[PDB]
Amino acid sequence: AFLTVERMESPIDSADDLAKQTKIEYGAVEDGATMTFFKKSKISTYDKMWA
Amino acid sequence: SKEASALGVQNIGGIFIVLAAGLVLSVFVAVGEFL
Numbered sequence A: 001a002f003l004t005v006e007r008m009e010s011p012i013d014s015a016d017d018l019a020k021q022t023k024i025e026y027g028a029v030e031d032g033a034t035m036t037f038f039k040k041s042k043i044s045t046y047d048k049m050w051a
Numbered sequence B: 001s002k003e004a005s006a007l008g009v010q011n012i013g014g015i016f017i018v019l020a021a022g023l024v025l026s027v028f029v030a031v032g033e034f035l
Helices: A002-008 A016-020 A044-050 B014-034
Strands: none
Touching: A016 A044
């Protein structure tokens, strides 16, 4: 179980892998052209990022 | 996503009871073996 927990998460966590996971915290300037493209322009993983 | 919990006493507690029951049954049947 420990090994599956540590391996199901993506160690390289490239782009879309960050959307599904929630353990790692992430963010940027609030509405500083970062999530302005994410509130609109619905893209699946980008929509998860906006959410 | 938080599941890194070991097999603690809550996870496994009845093993002590079953081993104690086995021990007491073993001695209770061994004392009658001599008779």
